[PDB]
């Protein structure tokens, strides 16, 4: 009742590795790392959003074993979608790119074994 | 630091209303009511969802205040979408009605005040 933890946990590093992968890119990319806070039309972020989150911090949370299960590896990439949602105009193209991804995710999320 | 709970929880009562509305019903009513298990092609569901969920359960939940934050609201929704997405093929015609419903919740609990 351990060890299917660490098998989950293996297939959140599956998951993550797919979202990275080049069929996945087009959408993809405005995830791979941290908003740029100090770019142009940025400069509300961190009043709106509490909590940032994106792919490489959740790297290197998978890698740092800062997750006790997949559970907590799922909250934080929803954390990334919402603030996307949260964060932006629902018309804007960046919304449609989470979605994309969000669909990657949460079939892959949903088939995983438990 | 707990009037904001209240206030949360009082907003997802409204996001589940409006999943249950007129707008959204053609493609929520399969997540309406419970997934009967003893229609024909369903005689492996409970082999496979450990955990059904669906709207009017989670009605229920909400109004007998089993909910301890939205936080809890939102991952009953999730398992409801996550169960099938798991049981279903992934072309198949609910999987996508489920993708329209998670549009409307997403969204909508994103832009949820905090
Ligand atoms: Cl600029
Ligand atoms: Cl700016
Ligand atoms: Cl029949
Ligand atoms: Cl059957």
């Given at each position: 009742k351990s060890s299917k933890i660490s098998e989950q946990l293996k297939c959140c590093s599956g998951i993550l590795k797919e979202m990275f992968?080049?069929?996945?890119?087009a959408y993809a990319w405005p995830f791979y790392?941290?908003?740029?806070?100090?770019?142009?039309?940025?400069?509300?972020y961190c009043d709106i959003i509490k909590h940032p989150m994106d792919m490489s911090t959740i790297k290197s949370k998978l890698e740092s074993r800062e997750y006790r299960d997949a559970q907590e590896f799922g909250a934080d990439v929803r954390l990334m979608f919402s603030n996307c949602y949260k964060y932006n105009?629902?018309?804007?193209?960046v919304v449609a790119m989470a979605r994309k991804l969000q669909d990657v995710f949460e079939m892959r999320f949903a088939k995983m074994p438990d």
């Open positions: 992968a080049k069929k996945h890119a790392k941290p908003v740029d806070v100090e770019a142009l039309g940025l400069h509300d105009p629902p018309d804007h193209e």
